Symmetry: C7
Subunit: 137 residues, 7 copies
């Protein structure tokens, strides 16, 4: 199951980092195996309502705690294949006082790296890049 | 099922890009087939509560992670057929310091492209265009 | 069922546009027919929990994605029959720097149109008009 | 049932407008009759899970779409019987730049009307009056 | 049941106003009696799922509509027995431009009354007092 | 059960005030006894769905109304054992105009007390201290 | 079970502090044992719906009360292995007036410690570091 999930993630392009892909494949395989085991246990007569409730509560708490990380990952996935965000492109993000100015140097799954005029490296979250006015010179 | 979903999306006009339409058709066909298979499995006696709980948790997490993308897509769908947003029209979006000024050059499913006076390309999110005061000269 | 829903929407005044009324009637008729079919299927013994879960997840995601459009529509419905918002009335919306000044020219289900002193057409969202201080001269 | 709901709304003072009271009585009577009919149908053996799910989804979407209207109505109900908000009383609402200054002229279920020094009529939402610092001279 | 709920509210100190206490006692007695009646009806065989769903939807909508009132009431309950908020005490609420300055004159379940230097009566919501920096001279 | 809950709260250090500990022990014992009684009633055949629904709705409404108090309590629990927040330590909380300056004098479960340069006592909510930049000289 | 959870937390690197790891292991072991006991009780015939409802309500309230702590912990986990945040690195967090300037001195699971130019110790929450523009010189 781990190999199947790894191949699916590679083909769909959701995860490109091999380490993240392996970790996600392991997590997904564990979740699927647990769900199948719970269904098999409940088939024969064993009550599964407490187990389902506890698993759902834990999963909801974990997902709500990792909301920012998930949002940044989804923004990174969506922003892929954008002509504005390319290496060497001078971009400006934000309107008003909350403005960010620099040249794109590297692209990540959590941050967008810009090189300022003074040489400082700027780490702009991908969610911030998603919900903002991007100005490309 | 994929062809049926593709034809439905084409006729309803929700998705116009052929690639996005094909991807959405594949996803919808997979979801419908999975739901039918789960119902058939539960009909004969196999417990389906753990599978339903896991699928619902995963779907809720994915939908909450793609909230910004979905909102931008819905805003793009709604804004279609607006006389204010046309190629060559000079529009102004926002009130106060958070103001955006330019001429519409291209329209997308994620961004609204404006050409400033200096020539910089502005990427205004469609959700931002939805919930803002649009000024058309 | 489509004719019944169209007549109900016409009588209740929720939807006045014939095209929107027809689309809403078709959607409502489809939803009611699907619910009745699911209930009939579940009556004879076929498990319906996976189908109900999938339909509910899809409906919740769609409704949460169209939240802004629904809010604007409800604001348009509520604001109807307001003496302040009339054609030719000079109104001012907002307090502070985020202020909008103009004369009402046309009223829509998504936007409120104002003509500025310079002649620019202002598109004020109906939700913004709902939750703001309206100043009428 | 309509007469009973109308009398209850009149006695409890939640709704004072006869038209709004009649509309709310009709809606409540329809909801109660539908719930009783669904319970009776489910008693004899007909599956009611799809119908309950569809009705709940529709009701949740409608209630979330009318959130602002409901909040304004509740604020209007709560603010009743306040010595500060009386006809002819000079009140000031808000702190900082977002300030509203005028004399109370009329009170509504959606807006609070103030007459400025220049004579402009101010429409302050009741929810805004609830969650703000009210200054009475 | 009304007398029991009234005595409980009096002893626990949640509600001190006799009118509010009587209204809350009536509401709580009605809710408990309705729940017991529904349970008794469902015991003998009558389906109760539609009734439970409708009651839950109505209760959730009402509770979400009265969120501000409930929050202000809870803040009033919590703030009781605070040395800073006493009659004749000169307090300052808020930081920055959104600042409120005055002397405490009267305390309520919805508002905190302050007398300014000019003599204007300030109505500070109890929720605002809860989530703000209180400065006591 | 009250003694067991009191001892557990004392050992875990969640509640240190004897009065609050006793009140929480009474509430927890009542909740556990009610849950056990409901389970016993439902075991013999009495329908418990209406009772569970009503109890859950009431508990959710109460918990959502006491959200600020619960958040402040949790922040007080978390901030315990912080070298920055000590008696006699000069700390500064917040960035920008919304800044608070003073010396720590007393620590509470709802507020953090600071003594300004002029001698005014500042009541900073513990939730505000949690989600802010603390500057220690 | 406590030893298994402790080893899992150590291997996965989610918790590095031995005290926090032991506390989390105890909590997780208690939760798993309680879920298994509830399932075993419900298998033989004892109704478990009230117990599940009460446990779920309590868990949801606790998780919503500890939302800030959980978010800060998740941000601390995510930020690990970032070249920008290292001891002795001069970083700047935030844009506009809400800006923080200093040199990293120590890293924690709740705060990020910076040494200003004047020598004041700055406590920047990890969630704030996650959702902000980090400037590294």
């Amino acid at each position: 199951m781990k190999r199947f999930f790894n191949r699916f993630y590679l083909d769909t392009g959701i995860i490109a980092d091999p380490s993240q892909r392996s970790l996600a494949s392991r997590v997904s395989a564990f979740l699927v195996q647990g769900a199948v085991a719970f269904s098999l246990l409940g088939t024969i007569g064993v009550d599964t309502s407490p187990l389902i409730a506890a698993a759902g509560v834990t999963g909801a708490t974990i997902g709500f705690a990792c909301k920012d990380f998930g949002t940044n990952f989804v923004a990174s996935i969506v922003l892929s294949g954008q002509q504005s965000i390319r290496t060497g492109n001078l971009v400006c993000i934000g309107t008003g006082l909350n403005v960010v100015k620099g040249k794109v140097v590297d692209w990540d799954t959590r941050y967008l790296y810009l090189r300022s005029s003074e040489g400082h490296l700027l780490h702009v979250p991908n969610n911030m890049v998603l919900n903002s006015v991007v100005t490309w010179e």
